Amino acid sequence: DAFRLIDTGALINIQALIHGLNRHYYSLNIDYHKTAKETKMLMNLHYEEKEESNLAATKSMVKIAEQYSKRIEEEKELTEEELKTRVGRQDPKKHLSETADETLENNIVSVLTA
Amino acid sequence: AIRDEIAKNTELSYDFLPLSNIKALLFFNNEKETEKFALERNWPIVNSKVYFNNQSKEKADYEDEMMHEEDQKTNIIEKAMDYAISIEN
Known about the structure:
Strand content of chain B: 5-15%
Shape of chain B: rod-shaped
Structural class of chain B: mainly alpha
PDB class: hydrolase
Function (chain B): Acts as a regulatory subunit of the 26S proteasome which is involved in the ATP-dependent degradation of ubiquitinated proteins. Necessary for activation of the CDC28 kinase.
Order of helices and strands of chain B: HEHHEEH
Largest interface: A-B, 5 and 8 residues
Number of helices of chain B: 4
Subunit structure (chain A): Component of the lid subcomplex of the 19S proteasome regulatory particle complex (also named PA700 complex). The 26S proteasome consists of a 20S proteasome core and two 19S regulatory subunits. Interacts directly with RPN8 and STS1.
Number of helices of chain A: 6
Distance between the termini of chain B: 55 Å
Number of strands of chain B: 3
Protein name (chain A): Ubiquitin carboxyl-terminal hydrolase RPN11
Radius of gyration of chain A: 28 Å
Oligomer: part of a larger assembly
Protein name (chain B): 26S proteasome regulatory subunit RPN12
Order of helices and strands of chain A: HHHHHH
Radius of gyration of chain B: 22 Å
Structural class of chain A: mainly alpha
């Protein structure tokens, strides 16, 4: 925040000054600006991509076991989940997708390399 | 029309066949009768024997870009499934 506690009148606040005894937090209204310029240089955060990307994280297969096992584990969680169908969340048809859907993509991106 | 089938059948059945047997199969009398066909068929032939070194047409242009595109299809399929992810709207 920024305080400067008093006004001219106001956006013109007015009374307590002439009535004296102005005290408060009294913020000002902040903003700021930069540019699209540094924005790039900022978003430059994250040779490069080719070196940085595909190919740089094509490492998967190292984990295929997990990548399996991760996917493997999904299975169990669900027979469980579905079962409760027989209330509120944990619901029989919820984490199912969010679970078997997280290992679906991450497992397709690797195909790009091969 | 009969034998062309048999020709393929021999083709299928036989990589190699005696130019006799094929003729015998063709019911031909001259094998040059046969020989024409087989070579019309463009069959590898040495002495006395019709051969099939390639019994089939493999490769030959079209039927491509799909059904054996490795990632491409897969990527298309990705792209597709990604559209199953994208058209998901």
